[PDB]
């Protein structure tokens, strides 16, 4: 413990956040936040459970070096620097916060589980510093580029549902994957997941592939770009505006001009031991 | 609890018309009052003779085109209809009946009928499907228009009807399950033989259009609801409406798009009777019409025989998959309605034993019915009404035998949920939360600990107690709330098991919100389980050595 208090101090003065202090108070069974705590008591803390507690700062968290379990979903945090030197951290859960500065975890080499769904996160390149991660929940954010996931090869469970990924090539080698969740993205081609022979649970529903605008024509023909794990086109389930599929082409008849056309696809897949349904909608803008 | 009305005899049909409910019952026609289902008026269609018979209602059709009135057809005098004219803002009952080669004023079969009604071009037209065997004409699929004289119907040409060859009249029959008009066509849903002299049975959908009394684009197509590969071949009920935004995106439908929610059952061997095994899927009309407008087909067999306007048929069934992923695999669903709240599509269903229940319908996966109870022991009828509008929260009229009940579209409170998870699985518009030891509404909370997001785990045993050193035995962890609530659903995504110092590899594909399965090895250890929200304990598992 580099960080530490030298003399008995009131909780209200260690932990600035009105709420977080009150969390400590309850944790160490104290009576009031005004009550004193010694560094001794601070070291006996292994886990903090404080979901939806209106926490806006975890200031004072640094004096808890033995803490290994953090449950902090449903708070207003946006700064995790107070966490950087808690060497013994393993599980850390921060959904529904606004922490986008994941570069603070660079030295949590014991961190195994990291949940950060619903934070507004675009850049996750900070993750390059935690190869040992076994479980990662990056669901519901603004992530487009997952190049960095190339290095987290110890993950047995990855979740990226509900973002903006269209390119999953960086996932090809993560063979140690068993649980993969990819719904609500822009995935067009599952050639990347070919080798994941360890999977047990996979999800791929409700994709949202969008195409670059095209001059509308009275007898439009849009090529099928959706591709299965082996590379084969996936026959469309339903086509908008009375369209047809004369493989590998999608065809429309547009006697009048319309902003766009589209087709839903549905393709049961199986990877390793996992049974999923690759499904979604391709959208074709027109001008 | 909720408004309900009991009649003297079975209820066959229900229509709603400007705040007044109309019941078609055996020997009576009731006029309840929408607000509280209170009986305001009635008419004894009575026991008619000809050697006493009962007058089972076969149709109700209101029409205010000419004058405000209600047409009704019974099953006694060769399916003859009668006018009921209202006296102003509201007894004066007429009748329709006039060289006997045909009989138009004979509309309805006592073997089962379905009646559509649409004023196409200055005249009211009745589109009717009749089941039948041997006896002197009623048509099986007819379109007889009513004259502005209002005293009788009239067929136009030979094409005004399509029937069954006398040689196959009794041999193989056709039950008309439901009928509806949409996209400028008319649709009939049937259960009939797969092929002439075939032992199994079908569900088909019929389409045609009308010109004077056209029936000009006639076509039959088979419909199958299969499970992931078991087939549910007998349509039991079928309702038609719009999809909620969620459901739509998944099936590629637009908000105004019409959809066919059909409940199928797995039939008995070489029969048309149903077993207690049910399924459901949705048929988008345009999707259907998409196939009706392409080109593998024979010539309507029960019409022509094995050998201008062609009446045709497809020889391979369109098929969709169960939206309940086998949820109702061992129950007989006998009634379906469909309404939208939010982005959600909710179906209120009915068992062959009297169980109304409401269920979020999604292409992603089944949800747990937020309503689920016992209307009377009598099976629920597929005859239903759904009045729901903005600034309002709507209701469903449901018929069980002699009884009809008005059931709210917001379900029936939270009090009935067994645990934090089910309680929190309920659809937003039910407004439930967990309050430590009970599920209930917001402002009715004891301790300030109401939550719509948080559930904590709890263990209640493990199998087995001990386990050999290196042995990767399967641990079965029995308990509660092992799952996490993300988006609006629960799953074991973030769920973890710890065997003191080492992790415990869960197989998720085999685990539930109540049961955990995972391989263990490589004492007297404590098992810690986290669902993502918090943790729980079990200090029993030992790494023994035989």
Swiss-Prot record, chain A:
Highest taxon listed in the record's lineage: Bacteria
Domain LRRCT: 208-287
Coiled coil: none
Region listing for Ig-like region, in residue ranges: 208-286
Chain positions of LRR repeats: 42-64, 65-88, 90-108, 109-130, 131-154, 156-174, 175-198
Disruption-associated phenotype: Deletion of inlB alone decreases host cell entry; the reduction varies from 99% to 37% depending on the cell line tested.
Domain LRRNT: 3-43
Localization (cell): Secreted; Cytoplasm; Cell membrane
Function text: Mediates the entry of L.monocytogenes into normally non-phagocytic mammalian host cells. Its host receptor is hepatocyte growth factor receptor (HGF receptor, a tyrosine kinase, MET) which is tyrosine-phosphorylated in response to InlB. Downstream targets MAPK1/MAPK3 (Erk1/2) and AKT are phosphorylated in response to InlB, which also causes cell colony scattering. Complement component 1 Q subcomponent-binding protein (gC1q-R, C1QBP) has been suggested to also act an InlB receptor, but this is less certain.
Assembly mode: Interacts via its LRR repeats plus the Ig-like region with the extracellular portion (residues 25-741) of its receptor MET; MET can bind HGF, its endogenous ligand, and InlB simultaneously. Probably forms a dimer upon interaction with host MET, which subsequently allows dimerization of the host MET and subsequent host signaling; dimerization probably occurs via the convex surface of InlB. Prevention of dimerization does not block interaction with MET but prevents downstream action.
The record's note on its domains: The N-terminus (36-79) resembles a truncated EF hand, the LRR region (80-240) has a curved form, while residues 241-321 form an Ig-like region; the whole region forms a curved tube. The LRR domain alone (31-241) binds mammalian MET and stimulates its Tyr-phosphorylation; the LRR plus Ig-like region (36-321) are required for receptor dimerization; adding the B-repeat allows the protein to scatter host cell colonies, and the GW domains, especially GW2 and GW3, potentiate MET activation.
Family: Belongs to the internalin family.
UniProt name for this protein: Internalin B
Organism encoding this protein: Listeria monocytogenes serovar 1/2a (strain ATCC BAA-679 / EGD-e)
Taxonomic path: Bacteria, Bacillati, Bacillota, Bacilli, Bacillales
Segment of the intact protein contained: 36 to 320 of 630
Curated annotation (Swiss-Prot), chain B:
Processing after translation: Dephosphorylated by PTPN1 and PTPN2.
IPT/TIG domain boundaries: 457-544
Localization: Membrane
Glycosylation sites: 4, 89, 133, 476, 501, 524
Effect caused by changing residue 299 to Y: Found in a case of cancer of unknown primary origin; uncertain significance; somatic mutation; the mutated receptor can sustain invasive cell growth in vitro
Extracellular side: 1-546
Ranges of residues in domain Sema: 1-409
Disulfide topology: 73-81, 103-106, 225-281, 414-432, 420-455, 423-439, 435-445, 504-518
Effect of residue 293 to K: Found in lung cancer also including cases carrying EGFR mutations; uncertain significance; decreased hepatocyte growth factor-activated receptor activity; decreased interaction with HGF
Tissue specificity: Expressed in normal hepatocytes as well as in epithelial cells lining the stomach, the small and the large intestine. Found also in basal keratinocytes of esophagus and skin. High levels are found in liver, gastrointestinal tract, thyroid and kidney. Also present in the brain. Expressed in metaphyseal bone (at protein level).
Function: Receptor tyrosine kinase that transduces signals from the extracellular matrix into the cytoplasm by binding to hepatocyte growth factor/HGF ligand. Regulates many physiological processes including proliferation, scattering, morphogenesis and survival. Ligand binding at the cell surface induces autophosphorylation of MET on its intracellular domain that provides docking sites for downstream signaling molecules. Following activation by ligand, interacts with the PI3-kinase subunit PIK3R1, PLCG1, SRC, GRB2, STAT3 or the adapter GAB1.
Disease: Activation of MET after rearrangement with the TPR gene produces an oncogenic protein.
This protein's domain notes: The kinase domain is involved in SPSB1 binding. The beta-propeller Sema domain mediates binding to HGF.
Family: Belongs to the protein kinase superfamily. Tyr protein kinase family.
Quaternary data: Heterodimer made of an alpha chain (50 kDa) and a beta chain (145 kDa) which are disulfide linked. Binds PLXNB1. Interacts when phosphorylated with downstream effectors including STAT3, PIK3R1, SRC, PCLG1, GRB2 and GAB1. Interacts with SPSB1, SPSB2 and SPSB4. Interacts with INPP5D/SHIP1. Interacts with RANBP9 and RANBP10, as well as SPSB1, SPSB2, SPSB3 and SPSB4. SPSB1 binding occurs in the presence and in the absence of HGF, however HGF treatment has a positive effect on this interaction. (Microbial infection) Interacts via extracytoplasmic residues 25-656 with L.monocytogenes InlB; MET can bind HGF, its endogenous ligand, and InlB simultaneously. InlB probably dimerizes upon binding to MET, which encourages subsequent dimerization of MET.
Protein name per UniProt: Hepatocyte growth factor receptor
Species this protein is from: Homo sapiens
Organism placement in taxonomy: Eukaryota, Metazoa, Chordata, Craniata, Vertebrata
Section covered of the full-length record: 42 to 657 of 1390
């Amino acid at each position: 413990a580099m960080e530490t208090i030298t003399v008995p101090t009131p909780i209200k003065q260690i932990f600035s956040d009105d709420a977080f202090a009150e969390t400590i108070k309850d944790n160490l069974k104290k009576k009031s936040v005004t009550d004193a705590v010694t560094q001794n008591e601070l070291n006996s803390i292994d886990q903090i459970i404080a979901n939806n507690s209106d926490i806006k700062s975890v200031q004072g968290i640094q004096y808890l070096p033995n803490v290994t379990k953090l449950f902090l979903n449903g708070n207003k945090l946006t700064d995790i620097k107070p966490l950087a030197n808690l060497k013994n951290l393993g599980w850390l859960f921060l959904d529904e916060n606004k922490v986008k500065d994941l570069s603070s975890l660079k030295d949590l080499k014991k961190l195994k589980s990291l949940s950060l769904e619903h934070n507004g996160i675009s850049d996750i390149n900070g993750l390059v510093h935690l190869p040992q991660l076994e479980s990662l929940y990056l669901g519901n954010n603004k992530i487009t580029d997952i190049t960095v996931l190339s290095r987290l090869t110890k993950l047995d469970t990855l979740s990226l549902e509900d973002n903006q990924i269209s390119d999953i090539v960086p996932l090809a080698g993560l063979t140690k994957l068993q649980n993969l969740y990819l719904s609500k993205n822009h995935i067009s081609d599952l050639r990347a997941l070919a080798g994941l022979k360890n999977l047990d649970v996979l999800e791929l529903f409700s994709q949202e592939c969008l195409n670059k605008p095209i001059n509308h024509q009275s007898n439009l023909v849009v090529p099928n770009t959706v591709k299965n794990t082996d590379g084969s086109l996936v026959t469309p389930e339903i086509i908008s505006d009375d369209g047809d599929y004369e493989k590998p082409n999608v065809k429309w008849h547009l006697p009048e001009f319309t902003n766009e056309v589209s087709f839903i696809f549905y393709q049961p897949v199986t990877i390793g031991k996992a049974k999923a349904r690759f499904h979604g909608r391709v959208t074709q803008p027109l001008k | 609890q909720l408004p309900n009305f009991t009649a003297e005899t079975p209820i066959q049909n229900v229509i709603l018309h400007e705040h007044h409910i109309f019941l078609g019952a055996t020997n009576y026609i009731y006029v309840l009052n929408e607000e509280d289902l209170q009986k305001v008026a009635e008419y004894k269609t009575g026991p008619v003779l000809e050697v006493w018979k009962d007058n089972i209602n076969m149709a109700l059709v209101v029409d205010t085109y000419y004058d405000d009135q209600l047409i009704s057809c019974g099953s006694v005098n060769r399916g003859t209809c009668q006018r009921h004219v209202f006296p102003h803002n509201h007894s004066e009952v007429h009748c329709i009946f006039s060289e006997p080669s045909q009989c138009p004023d004979c509309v309805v079969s006592a073997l089962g009928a379905k009646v559509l009604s649409s004023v196409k071009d200055r005249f009211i037209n009745f589109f009717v499907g009749n089941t039948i065997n041997s006896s002197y004409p009623l048509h099986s699929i007819s379109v007889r228009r009513l004259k502005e004289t209002k005293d009788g119907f009239m067929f136009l040409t030979d094409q005004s009807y399509i029937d069954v060859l006398p040689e196959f009249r009794d041999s193989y029959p056709i039950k008309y399950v439901h009928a509806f008009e949409s996209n400028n066509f008319i649709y009939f849903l049937t259960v009939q033989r797969e092929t002439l002299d075939a032992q199994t049975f079908h569900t088909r959908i019929i389409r045609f259009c009308s010109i004077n009394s056209g029936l000009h684009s006639y076509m039959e197509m088979p419909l199958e609801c299969i499970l992931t590969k078991e087939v549910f071949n007998i349509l039991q009920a079928a309702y038609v409406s719009k999809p909620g935004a969620q459901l739509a995106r998944q099936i590629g439908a637009s908000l105004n798009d019409d959809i066919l929610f059909a409940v199928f059952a797995q039939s008995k061997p070489d029969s048309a009777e149903p077993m207690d095994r049910s399924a459901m899927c949705a048929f988008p009309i345009k999707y259907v019409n998409d196939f009706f407008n392409k080109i593998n087909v024979r010539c309507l067999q029960h019409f022509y025989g094995p050998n201008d306007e062609y009446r045709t048929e497809f020889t391979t069934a369109l098929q969709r998959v169960d939206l309940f992923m086998g949820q109702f695999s061992e129950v007989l669903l006998t009634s379906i309605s469909t309404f939208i709240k939010g982005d959600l599509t909710i179906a209120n269903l009915g068992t062959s034993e009297g169980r109304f229940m409401q269920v979020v319908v999604s292409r992603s996966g089944p949800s747990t019915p937020h309503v689920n109870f016992l209307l009377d022991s009598h099976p629920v009828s597929p005859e239903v009404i759904v009045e729901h509008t903005l600034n309002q929260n709507g209701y469903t009229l449901v018929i069980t035998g002699k009884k009809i009940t008005k059931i709210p579209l917001n379900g029936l409170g939270c009090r009935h949920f067994q645990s934090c998870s089910q309680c929190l699985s309920a659809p937003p518009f039910v407004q439930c939360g967990w309050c430590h030891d009970k599920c209930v509404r917001s402002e009715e909370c004891l301790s300030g600990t109401w939550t719509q997001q948080i559930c904590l785990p709890a263990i209640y045993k493990v199998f087995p107690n001990s386990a050999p050193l290196e042995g990767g035995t399967r641990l079965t962890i029995c308990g509660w709330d092992f799952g996490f609530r993300r988006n609006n659903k629960f799953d074991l995504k973030k769920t973890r098991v710890l065997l003191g110092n080492e992790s415990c590899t869960l197989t998720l594909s085999e685990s539930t919100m109540n049961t955990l399965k995972c391989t263990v090895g490589p004492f007297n250890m404590s098992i810690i389980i986290s669902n993502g929200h918090g943790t729980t304990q079990y200090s029993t598992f030992s790494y023994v050595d035989p």
